């Protein structure tokens, strides 16, 4: 339900670009 | 498990199986190879175990109900008469007998449905299958 970088369907994940 | 109504007490003695057929109600079955006293609560221990391994079909037969009241030490004494009508209930299995016999699940899904079910019994048992044709 929360994290940074780490799921497929709600919205977090990780980070950069 | 427990019987519904009766007399109350008993005794104790032994001689090998006498009315534990073989095939009947199933394709696979478990047989006890030693003279024991199956505690009702050691049956539940099987049934349930056996269930889990299966999901549905419920092709499990427990043809060994507990017709036998046992007793106990009220705490210690000795000065009084017979005791503990309610310690628990037992079902005397004898060699060759058939407590279990699932039917319908895979040969394997049957050799595990017992393995486990056998790990909680006071004696040694082996599984069986067919060619059992005495009376029908």
């Amino acid at each position: 339900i929360a994290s940074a970088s780490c799921t497929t369907x709600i919205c977090t994940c990780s980070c950069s670009s | 498990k427990r019987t519904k109504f009766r007399k109350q007490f008993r005794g104790r003695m032994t001689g090998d199986a006498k009315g534990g057929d073989y095939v009947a109600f199933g394709d696979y079955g478990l047989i006890a190879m030693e003279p024991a006293w199956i505690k009702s609560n050691q049956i539940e221990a099987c049934r349930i175990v056996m269930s889990r391994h299966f999901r549905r079909g419920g092709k499990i037969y427990i043809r060994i109900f507990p017709d036998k009241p046992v007793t106990k030490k009220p705490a210690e004494t000795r000065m009084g008469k017979g005791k503990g009508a309610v310690e628990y209930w037992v079902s005397v299995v004898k060699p060759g007998r058939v407590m279990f016999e699932v039917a319908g699940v895979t040969e394997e899904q049957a050799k595990e449905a017992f393995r486990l079910a056998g790990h909680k019994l006071p004696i040694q048992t082996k599984m069986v299958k067919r060619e059992v044709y005495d009376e029908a």
Binding site: - | A17, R56, G57, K59, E131, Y133
Partner: protein, 175 residues
């Protein structure tokens, strides 16, 4: 099956792998004692709807059907047997096994088909041509479909000894 001896004393075998039977009809009720293993590998197939050559030591081929075998407890091992010499036009009545075939419309559905009665005995079989089995439908069967003897097709001639309306099988539900 070459059984040879037949004395009342089974010593000379009880150790030596050898079963001990007896066969008859009403005429001769000859004493018998065949080989364990042989019969052990034998009866398997033919069961009790299977007749085999009985050339007792001396050369006298005989015909008979498996009557009643009483095996050891504690040991699925068998000990005694009964052979009922085949007749010609009538043996008596026999015990025939119920068999399922083709996936049932109950299995996949949500339940499992159960065979209430395993083997089944029918009046008169007719010696020379006696069903060593009995395939049966199951497919149609759905959510609590009972099939009785008065349903199963019959092998041209044989008559059902078992009550017809009797549940030979029935698709069992889940749980």
């Amino acid at each position: 099956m070459e059984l040879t001896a037949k004395p009342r004393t089974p010593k000379q075998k009880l150790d030596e792998s050898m079963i001990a039977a007896v066969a008859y009809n009403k005429e001769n009720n000859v004493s018998f004692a065949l080989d364990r293993k042989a019969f052990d590998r034998a009866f398997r197939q033919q069961s009790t709807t299977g007749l085999f050559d009985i050339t007792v030591e001396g050369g006298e081929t005989f015909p008979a059907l498996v009557k009643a075998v009483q095996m050891d407890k504690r040991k699925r091992a068998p000990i005694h047997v009964d052979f009922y010499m085949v007749t010609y036009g009538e043996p008596v009545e026999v015990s025939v096994p119920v068999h399922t075939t083709g996936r049932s419309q109950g299995e996949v559905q949500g339940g499992l088909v159960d065979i209430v009665v395993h083997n089944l005995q029918i009046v008169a079989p007719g010696p020379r041509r006696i069903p060593q089995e009995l395939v049966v439908d199951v497919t149609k069967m759905n959510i609590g479909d009972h099939i009785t003897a008065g349903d199963i097709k019959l092998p041209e001639g044989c008559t059902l000894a078992a009550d017809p309306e009797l549940t030979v099988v029935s698709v069992l539900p889940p749980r």
